[PDB]
């Protein structure tokens, strides 16, 4: 049986690569986290609240320009708030009505909507008058578009509710370079701040990091038995923090190939949906199902600050890629921004 | 610009706020539910209740069905007819019911259901969709309810099977009761008239019964 | 959700293509990590709370 003997080969290579992994597990940060100072207290109280919405926010994305906020709600709507004018401009209904994940573009020319509808919409922006038009909608990827990306204003990569990972292109609207190695049911992924890299999500936790060109030789990140919901990078192109639903954030590192510290320090019995690093690479803001969110040191593995503005879960949150605000999107129609 | 376009921002959001207000009010008034994104909308008595299926995705769904907050129904009922190759769909349906009945956010969801009546020959067809001692023992022992109607052309088991399913369903709902909460049985009597009619009746009772879960002291 | 027979084939092909990946010392990788973090530790006002002096959304 070629299937059986080949799978047995698969466990043999798995054992070998785990032996290499353990050998690479030479040491641990112990001294560094023991002697380096604890991060200190955090307040980051209520600063900007997006009380405008009326449904359950399902996703969100700050724009690398730190200008306008996409929120792929569940009304047939996909609002676009603003960073520093405290309000919104293009509240733009949708052809289909229910979408889970958002997306966005660096500049403002595009903005997407790929989620429950099973269609990756891509909106447009000509003028700020009423009835904001729609650009080329994209489809052809079965199962709800679980999360999709715009590296620059021309390239679209998606990994969605099909257990596949595909790169479309806005104009041509066909596969550019897809990726097929995954098995979970993706629910979020994020992009390196240098735009050269995005890292996948997973249910079987194998949060894959593959390169935009073709997904070159990389690693699938075992462990971490719950789902991942919350992946974002710190500006080093080597590590992230897969947020979690079993309360256990992690800090898998691309360079070292290894996870570093889980965050299973109890008093939390809930889930987490989105986490984006304060670019210092030190704080790591992941929100908890209760009406609060609790800080996590990236290098001390000790919680240090509370973030409580919601009532129900927090569905997606984020930090400004400039370093000026942290934003949170709940299920209870409440989208909060903390300083 | 912004040194003068402050009025531009206020007018933009105010205009789209009025538009959004009205459109999502049209949404928020109406009510909705899963089914056997096909908004095959019906309309009765001052509301066009917003019926819609979801089928088409893959099967494993813990996060999609996670989305349904304020989506107030279950309808799926199956019979393992010719169309083995078919067996034990109820405990699939009943399991799914347990799920929606102990999930963190599907727990506050006043569910309903609609059975099938093509079961005129339960034990007399194929013995697989039949309720026998080899499928449910509860069926073999079970009694008759506090109100019966064994319609002709059926064995007594094939008659009271509807009430037996009713009582198993009430078992997993309220006899285990894990949530001190309510579920609604029904069946198909007149297509598109009695079906949707009882739909509105017991779904106004659904919104009623949400009003009683949510501000119980009427 | 892929239970096809060839799903094993694709997984094992990817695994074999992963039989030769880069290997980096964990201690020195983490060393560069916290060196990077401490180098930037003066930037994010979230990290050390720098007041509304530079923050736009200091409203009422």
């Amino acid at each position: 049986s070629e299937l059986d003997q080949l799978r047995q080969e698969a466990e043999q290579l798995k054992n070998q690569i785990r032996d290499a992994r353990k050998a690479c597990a030479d040491a641990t940060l112990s001294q560094i986290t023991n002697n380096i100072d604890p991060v200190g207290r955090i307040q980051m109280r209520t600063r900007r609240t997006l009380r405008g919405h009326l449904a359950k926010i399902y996703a969100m994305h700050w724009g690398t320009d730190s200008r306008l906020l996409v929120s792929a709600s569940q009304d047939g709507k996909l609002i676009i708030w603003d960073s520093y004018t405290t309000n919104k401009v293009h509240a733009i209904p949708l052809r289909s009505s229910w979408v889970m994940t958002c997306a966005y573009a660096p500049s403002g020319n595009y903005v997407a909507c790929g989620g429950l509808d099973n269609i990756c919409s891509i909106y447009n922006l000509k003028t700020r008058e009423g009835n904001v038009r729609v650009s080329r909608e994209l489809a052809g990827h079965t199962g709800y578009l679980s999360c999709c990306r715009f590296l620059d204003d021309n390239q679209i990569v998606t990994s969605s509710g099909d257990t596949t990972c595909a790169l479309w292109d806005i104009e041509t609207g066909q596969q550019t370079t897809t990726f097929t190695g995954h098995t979970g049911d993706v629910m979020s992924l994020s992009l390196a701040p240098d735009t050269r890299l995005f890292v996948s999500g997973a249910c079987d936790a194998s949060a894959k990091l593959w390169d935009v060109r073709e997904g070159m030789c990389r690693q699938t990140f075992t462990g971490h038995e719950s789902d991942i919901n919350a992946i974002c990078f710190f500006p080093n192109g080597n590590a992230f923090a897969t947020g979690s639903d079993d309360a256990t954030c992690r800090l898998f590192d691309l360079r070292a190939d290894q996870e570093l510290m889980t965050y299973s320090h109890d008093n939390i019995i809930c889930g987490i949906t989105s986490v984006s690093f304060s670019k210092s690479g030190r704080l790591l803001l992941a929100g908890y199902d209760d009406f609060n969110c609790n800080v996590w040191d990236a290098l001390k593995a000790d919680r240090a600050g509370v973030l409580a503005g919601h009532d129900n879960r927090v569905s997606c949150l984020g930090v400004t890629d400039d370093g000026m605000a942290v934003a949170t999107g709940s299920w209870d129609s409440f989208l909060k921004i903390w300083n | 610009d912004q040194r003068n376009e402050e009025k531009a921002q206020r007018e933009a959001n105010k205009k789209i706020e009025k538009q959004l207000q009205k459109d999502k009010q049209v949404y928020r008034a109406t009510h909705r539910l899963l089914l056997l994104i096909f908004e095959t909308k019906f309309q009765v008595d001052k509301v066009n209740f917003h019926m819609f299926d979801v089928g088409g995705q893959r099967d494993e769904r813990r996060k999609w069905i996670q989305c349904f907050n304020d989506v107030t129904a279950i309808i799926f009922v199956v019979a393992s007819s010719s169309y083995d190759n078919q067996t034990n769909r109820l405990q699939e349906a009943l399991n799914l019911f347990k799920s929606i009945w102990n999930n963190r956010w599907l727990r506050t969801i006043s569910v309903i259901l609609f059975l099938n009546k093509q079961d005129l020959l339960a034990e007399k067809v194929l013995a697989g969709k039949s309720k026998i001692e080899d499928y449910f023992p509860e069926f073999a022992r079970y009694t008759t309810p506090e109100d019966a109607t064994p319609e002709p052309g059926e064995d007594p088991r094939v008659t009271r099977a509807k009430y037996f399913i009713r009582d198993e369903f009430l078992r997993i709902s309220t006899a285990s009761g894990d949530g001190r909460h309510y579920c609604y049985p029904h069946f198909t009597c007149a297509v598109d008239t009695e079906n949707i009619r009882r739909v509105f009746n017991d779904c106004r009772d659904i919104i009623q019964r949400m009003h009683l879960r949510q501000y119980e002291l009427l | 959700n892929t239970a096809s027979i060839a799903q094993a084939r694709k997984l094992v092909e990817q695994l074999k293509m992963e039989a030769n990946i880069d290997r980096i010392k964990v201690s020195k990788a983490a060393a560069d990590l916290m060196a990077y973090c401490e180098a930037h530790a003066k930037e994010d006002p979230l990290l050390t709370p720098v007041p509304a002096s530079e923050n736009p959304f200091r409203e009422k």
């Epitope: 249910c203 079987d204 719950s226 789902d227 079993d246 | 099967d59 813990r62 102990n102 | 959700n1």
Partner: nanobody
Framework: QVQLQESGGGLVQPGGSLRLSCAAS????????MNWVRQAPGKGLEWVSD????????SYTGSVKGRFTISRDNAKNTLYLQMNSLKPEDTAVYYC?????????????????????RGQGTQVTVSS
């Protein structure tokens, strides 16, 4: 990492003189539910049993109602359950499935195509 490798099965008679068990790996097993699911010839995703947050309802399907018992134990870190005397000569491959999202007493997903957290299978059929 989730080395949900089965243990037990392969071949057994209607006597069912064999025991099935599981393999868990590195998590708060004391907060997951569990359940076991078998596979009818091709379309088999029935819900054979479960075992709630230890010290709660332990239910079973109509085909095996009341008869099965499902074994949980922290120390051995191996989820057991006993089989015998009622269709144990089934050709249905079992699966030591695992209810996701610990710290709440519910689970979903008996999906018909390979499932994330469940084991790769557990043979059982008739010996000679």
């Amino acid at each position: 990492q989730v080395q949900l490798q089965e243990s037990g099965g392969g071949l057994v008679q209607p006597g069912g003189s064999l025991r099935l068990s599981c393999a868990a790996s590195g998590f708060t097993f004391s907060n997951y539910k569990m359940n076991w699911v078998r596979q009818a010839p091709g379309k088999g995703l029935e819900w054979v049993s479960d075992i709630s947050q230890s010290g709660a309802s332990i239910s079973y399907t109509g085909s095996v109602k009341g008869r099965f018992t499902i074994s949980r134990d922290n120390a051995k870190n191996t989820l057991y359950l006993q089989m015998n005397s009622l269709k144990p000569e089934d050709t249905a491959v079992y699966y030591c499935a695992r209810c996701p999202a610990p710290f709440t007493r519910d689970c979903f997903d008996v999906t018909s195509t390979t499932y994330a957290y469940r084991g790769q299978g557990t043979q059982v059929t008739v010996s000679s």
